[PDB]
C-alpha cells in the first residue's frame with residue numbers, strides 16, 4: 001500500500017459526486033518533486049462508487065507501457081480510498097490540439113505535421129500494447145488521450161466522469177450510453193467489441209488529430225444518421241459513408257484511415273502496422 005503520508009497536496013484538479021481529484025507532489029520519488037494525480041473517494045461515497053473504484057484499480061494495475069496511463073500506487077487498506085497516477089500537465093489531446101494551429105509555412109501556439117504523426121504513432125504504440133494483452137479499450141478518442149511533457153501521449157479512460165464531452169455519447173435502447181461516432185459498425189448493431197473495432201476508433205482518432213480536433217466526426221449528420229450508416233455497412237450495397245479527408249491529410253494517409261474502416265474485422269490493419277506507417281511513412285501525396 002502506497003504511504004499516503006508521502007502525498008503533498010498542491011491543487012484540486014476536479015470534483016465529482018463520489019470523489020475529488022488532486023494534484024500532489026512526492027518528495028524524493030526514487031523512494032524537483034514528482035507530480036502525481038490522486039483520486040480520493042469521499043468518506044460518504046456509495047458502496048457502488050467504492051465497487052467501481054476497486055475494479056478500476058484492478059484493471060489499471062496490469063497496464064505498464066510508456067503510452068498508457070500508469071497506476072503508481074493505491075491507498076486501500078484504510079479510508080479514504082486513494083489511487084495515484086502520472087500527472088499529464090497538458091490535459092487531454094482534444095483540449096491540447098484545439099488550442100493549437102497547424103504549422104504551415106505557406107500561410108496562439110503552433111504544431112507541425114510531423115508532430116501530429118508522432119502523437120498518433122504514440123497512440124498506435126499504446127494500443128498495440130493493449131491489443132497484445134487482449135484488452136479492448138472500447139472508447140478510444142482524443143478526449144481519452146492525455147498529453148504530458150515532451151509531447152508524450154498516454155491513452156487513458158475517463159468514461160463519462162467529465163460532463164465536457166456529453167455530445168460525443170448517445171443513449172441507446174437500454175440506458176447504455178455509447179460513443180457511436182467512434183464505434184465500428186458491428187459494435188453499434190451487435191455489441192461486438194474487439195481489438196479490430198479499437199482500430200476503427202483509432203481511424204476516427206487519427207481523423208481528429210489531422211483535423212486538430214476542430215470538428216466532431218460526421219458533425220453534419222445526426223446521431224440517428226450515424227446509426228443508420230452502420231446498417232449500411234452491414235447491407236454492403238455501396239451506400240455506406242466515410243469521414244471526409246481532413247484538409248491537411250495527404251491521400252496516402254487518408255487511404256490508411258479508410259482501411260481502419262474496412263467492413264471486415266480481419267481486413268483492418270493491426271496496430272503494429274499503423275504504428276510503423278505513422279512513424280516511417282509520411283512521404284505520401
Ligand SMILES: C[C@@H]1CN(c2cncnc2)Cc2cc(C(=O)Nc3cc(CN4CCN(C)CC4)cc(C(F)(F)F)c3)ccc21
Pocket residue numbers: 013021037038039056059060063068069083085086087088089091137146155156157158159160
Ligand atoms: C485521478 C487521475 C486523473 N488523471 C489526470 C492525469 N493528468 C492530468 N490530470 C488528470 C488521470 C487518470 C486516469 C485514469 C484512467 O485512465 N483510468 C482507467 C480506467 C479504465 C477502466 N475503466 C473503468 C470504468 N470506466 C467506465 C471506464 C474505464 C481503463 C483505463 C485504460 F485506458 F488505461 F485502459 C484507464 C484514472 C484516474 C486518473
